[PDB]
Amino acid sequence: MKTFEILKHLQADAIVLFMKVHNFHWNVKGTDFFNVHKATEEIYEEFADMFDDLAERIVQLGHHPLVTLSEAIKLTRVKEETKTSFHSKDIFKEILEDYKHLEKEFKELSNTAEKEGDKVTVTYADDQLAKLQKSIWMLQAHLA
Amino acid sequence: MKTFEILKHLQADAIVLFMKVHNFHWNVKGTDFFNVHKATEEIYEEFADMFDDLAERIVQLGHHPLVTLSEAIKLTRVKEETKTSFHSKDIFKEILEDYKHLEKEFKELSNTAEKEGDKVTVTYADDQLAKLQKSIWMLQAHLA
Amino acid sequence: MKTFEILKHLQADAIVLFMKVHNFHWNVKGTDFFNVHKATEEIYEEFADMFDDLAERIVQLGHHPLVTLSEAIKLTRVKEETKTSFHSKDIFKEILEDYKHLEKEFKELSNTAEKEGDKVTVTYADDQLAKLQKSIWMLQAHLA
Amino acid sequence: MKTFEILKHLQADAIVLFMKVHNFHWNVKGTDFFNVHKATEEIYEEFADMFDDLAERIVQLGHHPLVTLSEAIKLTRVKEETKTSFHSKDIFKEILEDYKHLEKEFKELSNTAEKEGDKVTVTYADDQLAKLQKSIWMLQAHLA
Amino acid sequence: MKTFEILKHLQADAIVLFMKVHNFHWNVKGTDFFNVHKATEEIYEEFADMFDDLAERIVQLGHHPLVTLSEAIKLTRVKEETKTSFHSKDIFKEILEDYKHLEKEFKELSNTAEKEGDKVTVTYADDQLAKLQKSIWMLQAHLA
Amino acid sequence: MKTFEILKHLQADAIVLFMKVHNFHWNVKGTDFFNVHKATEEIYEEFADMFDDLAERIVQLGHHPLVTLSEAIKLTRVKEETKTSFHSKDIFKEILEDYKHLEKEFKELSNTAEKEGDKVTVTYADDQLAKLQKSIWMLQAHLA
Amino acid sequence: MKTFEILKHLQADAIVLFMKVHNFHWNVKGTDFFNVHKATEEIYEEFADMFDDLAERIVQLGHHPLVTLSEAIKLTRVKEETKTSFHSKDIFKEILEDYKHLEKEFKELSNTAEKEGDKVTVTYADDQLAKLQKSIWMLQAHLA
Amino acid sequence: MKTFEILKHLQADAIVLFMKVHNFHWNVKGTDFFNVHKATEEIYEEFADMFDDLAERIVQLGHHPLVTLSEAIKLTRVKEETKTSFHSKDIFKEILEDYKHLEKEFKELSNTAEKEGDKVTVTYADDQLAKLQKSIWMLQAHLA
Amino acid sequence: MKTFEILKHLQADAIVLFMKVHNFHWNVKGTDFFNVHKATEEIYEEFADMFDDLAERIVQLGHHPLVTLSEAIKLTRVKEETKTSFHSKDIFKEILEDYKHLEKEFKELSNTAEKEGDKVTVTYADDQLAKLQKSIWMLQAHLA
Amino acid sequence: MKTFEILKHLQADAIVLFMKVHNFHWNVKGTDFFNVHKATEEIYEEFADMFDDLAERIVQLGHHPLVTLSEAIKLTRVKEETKTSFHSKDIFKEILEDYKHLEKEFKELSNTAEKEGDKVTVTYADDQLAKLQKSIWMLQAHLA
Amino acid sequence: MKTFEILKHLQADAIVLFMKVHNFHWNVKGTDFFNVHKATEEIYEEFADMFDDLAERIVQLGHHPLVTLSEAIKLTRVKEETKTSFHSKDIFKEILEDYKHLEKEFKELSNTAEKEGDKVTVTYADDQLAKLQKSIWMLQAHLA
Amino acid sequence: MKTFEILKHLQADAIVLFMKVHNFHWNVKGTDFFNVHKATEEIYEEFADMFDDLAERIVQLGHHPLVTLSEAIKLTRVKEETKTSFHSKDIFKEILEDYKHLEKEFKELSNTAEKEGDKVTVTYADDQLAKLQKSIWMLQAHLA
């Protein structure tokens, strides 16, 4: 609910999503393999970058970012994926739903940070929103 | 004990160590801050790369790499760090001990893979050993 | 009046302005030729980029960008230039007035998008405003 | 029929085709999205470059290139596309037919320019023919 | 109090701070020399860049930036440093306090510009705030 | 059976495979064209590089590499492909089987070279094995 | 005699010549070794590129390029070299004679393609002629 | 009149023109100085490149290029400029007339080489014609 | 009169001149705007670099460079410019006179440093003289 | 005898030597062709650069550089070479003697400029001397 | 005999060989000068790199690398060359014999390190063997 | 005392100092390790470059540079360091004293070369003096 709390929960989602997409990356099979293998590598590296960005946002608010993977699992709103076989369509469907979750949270981040006069977090949140809106649009087109 | 099992436990250590050093990176304080902040970023990105490399080694053996962060926590031999205040000397002492752990495991990896005639894993293991030996030497010199 | 409508009319202006400045580029004569020839190429490529950017903004709002050149001509607020002989001073005077038009529209874009809570379009609009303010200042100095 | 007239009509086709493929680019849906989205961006930028090249050819013959988008619509032999929903196969079928049209025109350009002793336009036309022949071959293979 | 006045006083601070840190750069002594010598060069070049950025912001508001160094000294809120011997710790303490001053002013810049509907200055101010927040955090960690 | 003999037969396979995949590259048709056309170009250039590498290995053992294409055809274990129409799936199936053949041979190369104390050929063979294992894994995933 | 037939026979010559010069490259001995070793690597890579270029020319005429090395040996006008010992002077003498052969064929290619109105093959042929004329001139100077 | 004779006279013109424009470059005065100083450096380096290109064309025809500056002065159709004071307008007027001379000669080069079946010189001549046509157009626009 | 004193007064001139030309840069108006705006940015950055170079020369002589802007104003021989409106011709006239001043001082620097056997300052001074002589020549040509 | 006179005569030598070595470049024959062809291209481009450098030195002294090739022939101390057949050894012998001539002149340049207090020409002359001494040493070693 | 002892003696050879080839580099005379001068610079820089690599291998074994040049002379198996005149053929003969010495030692290094389970030194040794085998082959071809 | 003798003794110092700092590089321990390890690598590579530069200066005077490491030890004025344990402060103290020695010698080099009219060695010596003065200043600041 507070800005740093939204950030910390997003940092948890970021690494959990990194792991989820890492799973997809190595376990994707079928005629779409080559495209999905490449796309998922880009997607999980973006989540790795987001993890780093969010940590930076947290310290500048005078708080500690995630300390452990145990803490990431605690705070995450993302369900971890235990399956190792999917079809490529289901991979993109899953990632889309996760992006939609993130968009909702970054919207809340922006609004909450604005109310506190936290101009830097607002900028960061709005920039992430632009990236997410593009990713969502492309996955929606792919799945249409 | 089997090659793929050593690899999977190392993949678990890799991401746990990534997280541990990420913690150090953001929480380091004192006159050594600037050097340790930079060094730890390089160190955690190396563990992130190792995580990826090990996943690749696992699939080529016909097995699944780590599926979840929960699975990483299960398999890891590394204790997760919950503290958020250290002195820079203790950070390097900790990382050194972790490197020493990894060196022992990559030695075992190389030996085990050789016994199975797994030439590619041997090459990978021996290459990692070279990197670890350099990191260990430098931390030992720093702490001498 | 709605955000997507402002965007679509701006996309129309963008390509019409691209064409207008393309005309200037090839038809400029006189001792200022070399500077104006180069400047106008940069200016029309900026309008080409704007055309692309605006299309991206439109799809993310769930609408279709411009479909045809006929549609661009319909929606544009910019008068198309049929002359093929100008003096370089009149070229810069014309472009300045077009920039001023665009600035007014991007101001309206920013305000309208803000009212709808469209954070991404606001960022885009404000970024374009910065570019336009620089272009306007330089043309005003040139013509002073 | 004269060289400059062929060039001017081709310049009209170039920007109309730029717009047509820009439409395809943003409106493509389905499992082929990512490949077609990328390919169409390359294709429309090629038509944008062709537009520029043709303008250069026109001025060197002592004539004015296209002045307005209205003039492009007047001179074009290409039907503008008002639809906003296609399947990816139909996009490539359409572009192929347009390439075939262009090849016929650039053939005529080369022959006409040769008859007038316009060596530079011949070179330009023959170079464009090489590009078109490659594009056509690849689309034909894709659709076979 | 007005946006252009805040900008002009900040431009004065920027060059005065450039000079102050230039002084530190050349006069730093002791075992920290090499790190501080390098860091201060980066810091003073950032203030030189800020000086330029602020001048650009001023002209776009229709005002004149600083005309002379005499004018910079008049408008500055920063005390000029006449000492030529410091310890490296005091250098970082001083720079931190200056950054804190700048952060307060850029906050005021952002708020004031927002009230006037000056969207471009707001963006500029908020971007500078992000840079300052990072610099402050790192110096605070170093000094903790 | 001797190291240089394995190398020479592999050099023969390399150029024969280069040619086979060159055939696939130009003759592939269908909706997968663009991906297969690109992939096969990379694959045949890898076989061209392998051809060169193997020649280098042969001379360092004091023997002559392949002298003629006639000699390559003589020594090869690979059947030359006379067909000019395939479906993309069959192309990848074929290449996979060829990779599997190569992996078996490079395994034998490594083992044989080790027995002779030829350390350099062992390194070369094991490095090629790593490349082949990756290629095989990806084709197997694609075809699963 | 037909354009595609000239192209196919040239494609055969290209790979046969690649192989011939590859032979020279690895088997050259004597005080000229270092210069000839380097020059021959450049020469055989040029023949490899020519092989690719000619295949592209063939498909655009609606025909199949070379399918197998057996087919290259069938169609080639170049004698394969079975010797493994030469002097560097004889290497350059041989390559010169091969270049002269190619020049004659590319001349015929250009003339034949022109008669059929194949503008693209003419351009390609004339471009190759320029390269060959340079290579021939330099070898003639070397041997004078 | 023969191809090699046209080439040799053009090589003479090239270096004489290099010298003429070198003179302009260093002796230009007035408010246009900076633009003309830069433009003339580009122009004289182009003539230096042309000098080299023409020499290459001559040797491939089995003839000797220019041996001495005395020979260049003998063969040139260009009047050498002894003045050291001009106005920038007269510089561009002069260069334009020289370009026009060159265009006429390269036209004759192309036609003459075509009659002899010298395909490579034709290509070279036509390529130079394209460059000259652009230079002429721009100078004509500048002077209009 | 002493080497370090000449250097310190030149360092004062350098930053004062940086400021003077910064003023010109932002306040230039008229048809020459674009060229003068660009040229003045290069000129003021050169003075900024000179400021740095001179500081380095001072410390190597065992003295302190300028401590404050107040000290720069004290030591400078350059009049600060309070005007904000000039014509471009007067800008270049002013800068020329300043360059001439600097040339006289760097001449004195070189001579004085030579008398003291200060070889490094001589080299530095003579290198600056070369730069100044070029700048002066070009401005004199522009104004002729 | 005066500095500007030495410079002007050297500028004449520079272009005459450019031409002489250009002659060598295109007319060299024999087993050394490839090395001499390359070396002479580097050598003549160095003389072309020297020509430019010397012109710059002349204008900064308030004089006109060479106006025409006729003037270069007048002032040169270098004999123009009319032969078109040499052996590679004689080419290097000739160039060596020319370098030796230049070294003597640049020595005189340095001494004369020093006497006039022309610090910039001294620096230029001494820098050229370093280049010449290296070239001479290498040619002497080659010919030993 | 122990791994670290082999390494230390090789480090001694490395710098002694660096010096020997440095001698050759500067003292080579005759028509082969330019090729040998260049080749020897590459060769001595390789020995300089080897010197560094071996030092790194030594410290990782917990020992001190060479402390002094006196120690290098003590441990080396390479005879230092006091002559200053050779023919280029004798230079390559000498270097070949030194390479052969090194190959024998790196073979022993690899075998000895393997027996101790020193996987990293084995990798290093085998990699050096590959480089040496290439160098030896090329020198043998040159001298054949 | 003669120029070539000063150069030869400096070449001896250069490689001895290279070795001394190489020793420091690998044997440095303690909290300053990372900075000193890096700095010393840069320092010893500078001495390696100096070694090369001095050899070049010697041959251009018609003399032989150092032939052997034995000769370097003979001529050096630098004491070789046999210790393998130091503290980082003592490393910088030692290097400073060596730099001071070099500065004295390069001063003598410059003066001696000037007396002989050796302009090139003077330039070289004065350039080295500039580098040394910077290195000395920084080490003095570090140790203050």
- What CATH number did the domain enclosing H95 receive? 1.20.1260.10
Residue burial D12-39, b: 16+ Cβ < 10 Å; e: rest: bbbbbbbbbbbbbbbbbbebbbbbbbeb
Count the domains in chain D: 1
Cα A133–Cα A138–Cα A142 angle in degrees, nearest 5: 150
DSSP tag of L29: -
Q: How far apart are CA K113 and CA K54, in angstroms?
A: 14
How close L99 comes to chain B (CA, Å)?
26
Asked if chain B contacts chain E via 3 or more Cβ pairs within 8 Å, the reply is yes
Report how far apart the first and last C-alpha atoms of chain C are (Å, whole number).
35
Burial H2-26 (b: 16+ CB within 10 A, else e): ebbebbbbbbbbbbbbbbbbbbbbb
DSSP summary character for residue G95:
H
Nearest Cα to E27, choosing from E80, E86, E81, E82? E86
Substitution target in D138, D142, D143 with the highest count of F β-carbons within 10 Å is D142
User: Is the distance from CB of C106 to CB of E96 less than 8 angstroms?
Assistant: no
DSSP state of L80: P
DSSP string, B26-70: HH--STTHHHHHHHHHHHHHHHHHHHHHHHHHHHHTT------HH
- Name chain D contacts of A141, Cβ cutoff 8 Å: 28-30, 33, 37
Residues comprising chain F, all counted: 144
* Contact (CB, 8 A) for F103 and F132: yes
Could you say which DSSP state residue I60 is in? H
Q: How far apart are CA K103 and CA K95, in angstroms?
A: 12
User: Are residues D78 and D15 in contact, defined by beta-carbon separation less than 8 angstroms?
Assistant: no
Q: Which long-range contacts (CB under 8 A, 24 or more apart) does K83-86 make?
A: K83/L67, K84/K23, K84/K27, K84/L64, K84/L67, K85/K27, K85/K29, K86/K24, K86/K27, K86/K28
| Alpha-carbon gap, residue K17 to K21, rounded angstroms | 6
Q: What is the rounded CA–CA span in Å between residue C83 and residue C26? A: 12
DSSP assignment, residue F32? T
Q: Report the greatest alpha carbon distance in chain G.
A: 50
Tokens of J2: 């005066």
Q: Where are the beta strands (DSSP E) in chain D?
A: none
Distance CA C67, CA D27 (A): 10
DSSP character string of E6-58:
HHHHHHHHHHHHHHHHHHHHHH--STTHHHHHHHHHHHHHHHHHHHHHHHHHH
In whole angstroms, what is the distance from residue G103 CA to residue G97 CA? Answer: 10
- Best to test chain I binding among H27, H34, H38 (most I CBs inside 10 Å): H34
**Cβ-Cβ contacts under 8 Å, I48 against chain E:** 48
DSSP state of A116: T
Nearest to J52 by CA among A48, H23, G95: H23
J119/I126 CB distance under 8 A: yes
Q: Which of G35, G89, G141 sits opposite J29 (nearest CB)?
A: G141
CA J37 to CA H55: how far, in whole Å?
Answer: 13
Is residue A27 classed exposed, middle or buried when 0-12, 13-18 and 19+ CB atoms within 10 A define those classes? buried
K33/J89 CB distance under 8 A: no
Identify the residue whose tokens are 């619509």.
Answer: D73
Residue with tokens 């087109």: A141
Helix B119-143 to helix K119-143 angle (10° resolution) is 110
Residue D31 DSSP label: T
Interface test with chain F among K107, K119, K131, K133, by most F beta carbons within 10 Å: K133
Query: Which among J90, J115, J70 is positioned nearest to J23, based on CA atoms?
Result: J90
Q: At what angle do helices K88-115 and K3-27 cross, to 10 degrees?
A: 170
Chain length of chain B? 144
Contact D30 A144 (CB under 8 A): yes
Report the C-alpha dihedral over residues I139, I143, J3, J4, rounded to 10 degrees.
Answer: 130
The answer, yes or no, to whether C and A have at least 3 beta-carbon pairs within 8 Å is yes
Q: After which residues is chain K broken (C to N over 2.5 A)?
A: none
Any alpha helices (H) in A31-116, and if so which ranges? 33-60, 69-75, 88-115
Asked if A120 lies within 8 A of E133 by C-beta distance, the reply is yes
State the amino acid at position I125 in one-letter form.
A
d(C-alpha J12, C-alpha J78), whole Å: 9
Residue E34: list chain L partners with CB under 8 A.
35, 39, 138, 142
Cα–Cα distance for residue pair L135/K41, rounded to 1 Å: 28
Q: Is E82 exposed, middle or buried (0-12, 13-18, 19+ CB in 10 A)?
A: exposed
Please name which of G95, G98, G87 lies closest in space to residue G33, comparing C-alpha atoms: G87
Q: Which amino acid is at H129?
A: L
Closest C-alpha among I83, K132, J12, J120 to residue H22: J12
DSSP assignments along H51-115, one per residue: HHHHHHHHHHTT------HHHHHHH--SPPP------HHHHHHHHHHHHHHHHHHHHHHHHHHHH
Neighbours of B86 (CB within 10 A): 19
Q: Are the Cβ atoms of G133 and H59 closer than 8 angstroms? A: no
Closest CA to L123 of G121, F115, J134: J134
User: Which residue is associated with the tokens 């090249």?
Assistant: D53
Are the CB atoms for C10 and C53 separated by under 8 Å?
no
Report the gap between the CA of K131 and the closest CA in chain J (Å). Answer: 27
Considering only CA atoms, give the Rg of chain D.
15
Q: Cβ of B133 and K123 within 8 Å?
A: no
Q: Give the span between the Cα atoms of H103 and H109, in whole angstroms.
A: 10
Nearest CA in chain H to I144: H30
Q: Which residues of L50-78 are buried (b: 16+ CB within 10 A; e: fewer)?
A: bbbbbbbbbbbbeebbbbbbbbbbebbeb
> Which DSSP letter does residue F80 get?
P
Structure tokens at L126: 């004065």
Under a CB-based contact definition with an 8 Å cutoff, are residues A143 and A32 in contact? no
Structure tokens at E60: 């776009």
Alpha-carbon gap: F26 to the closest alpha carbon of chain G (Å): 7
Domain of L101, in residue numbers:
1-144
Contact D137, G56 (CB under 8 A): no
DSSP states of K78-120 as a string?
A: SPPP------HHHHHHHHHHHHHHHHHHHHHHHHHHHHTT-HH
Backbone phi, then psi, for C99, in 5-degree steps? -55, -45
Give one word for J99, left, alpha or beta, with left for phi > 0 and alpha for psi -120 to 50.
Answer: alpha
Which amino acid, L105? E
Q: Is I39 an 8 Å CB contact of chain H?
A: yes
Tell me how far the alpha carbon of residue F85 is from its chain's centroid.
Answer: 22
- State which residue of chain F sits closest to D141, comparing Cα positions: F29
Measure the CA–CA gap between L40 and L23, rounded to whole angstroms: 9
**Does the CB of B16 have a partner CB in chain A at under 8 Å?**
yes
Taking CB atoms within 8 Å and a gap of at least 24, the contacts of G103-112 are: G103/G129, G103/G132, G103/G133, G103/G136, G105/G6, G105/G9, G105/G10, G105/G13, G105/G77, G106/G10, G106/G132, G107/H119, G108/G6, G109/G3, G109/G6, G109/G7, G109/G10, G110/H119, G112/G1, G112/G2, G112/G3, G112/G6
Phi-psi region of H86 (alpha: psi -120 to 50; beta: other; left: phi over 0): beta
Considering only the beta carbons, identify the residue of B39, B138, B142 that sits closest to L31: B142
Q: Say which residue the tokens 């490449």 belong to.
A: A38
The Cα K56–Cα K60 span in angstroms is 6
Question: Which chains have 3+ CB pairs within 8 A of B?
Answer: A, E, F, K, L
Q: Does C142 touch chain I (CB under 8 A)?
A: yes
Q: Which of D101, B92, H61, H99 is nearest to L30 (CA)?
A: B92
Contact G26 F84 (CB under 8 A): no
CB of D64 less than 8 A from some CB of H: no
Nearest Cα to Cα of residue B42 among B50, B31, B32: B50
